[PDB]
Structure 1
Amino acid sequence: VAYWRQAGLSYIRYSQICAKAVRDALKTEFKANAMKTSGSTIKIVKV
């Protein structure tokens, strides 16, 4: 087992964090594309 698991976290969520980190570690010249991706539009409709 990993630390993130058992802690309630799943792998997609890990990948999420990992992928974002790599982004924040880029340089404006490639930082633009960051927006043209990693969206968050989707909205939950739970009933």
Structure 2
Amino acid sequence: VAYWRQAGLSYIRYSQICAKAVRDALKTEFKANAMKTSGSTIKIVKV
């Protein structure tokens, strides 16, 4: 087991964090594309 698991976290969520980190570690010249991706539009409709 990993630390993130058992802690309630799943792998997609890990990948999420990992992928974002790599982004924040880029340089404006490639930082633009960051927006043209990693969206968050989707909205939950739970009933």
TM bracket (short chain): over 0.9
- Give the count of matched residue pairs: 47
Alpha-carbon separation, structure 2, partners of 1:8 and 1:42: 23
**In structure 2, C-alpha distance between the alignment counterparts of 1:21 and 1:38, rounded to whole Å:** 12
- Report deviation, 1:32: 0.0
For residue 17 of structure 1, report the CA deviation from its aligned partner. 0.0
Distance 1:13 1:37 in 2: 16
**Partner Cα separation in structure 2 for residue 45 and residue 19 of structure 1:** 26
For structure 2, which runs of at least 5 residues remain unmatched after alignment? none
4+ residue runs over 3 A deviation? none
The alignment-based identity, stated in percent, is 100
TM-score by length of 1: 1.00
Instruction: Supply the RMSD in Å over aligned alpha carbons.
Output: 0.0
Structure 1: give runs of 5+ residues left out of the alignment.
Answer: none
1:4-35 deviations in Å (ceiling 9; x for gaps) = 00000000000000000000000000000000
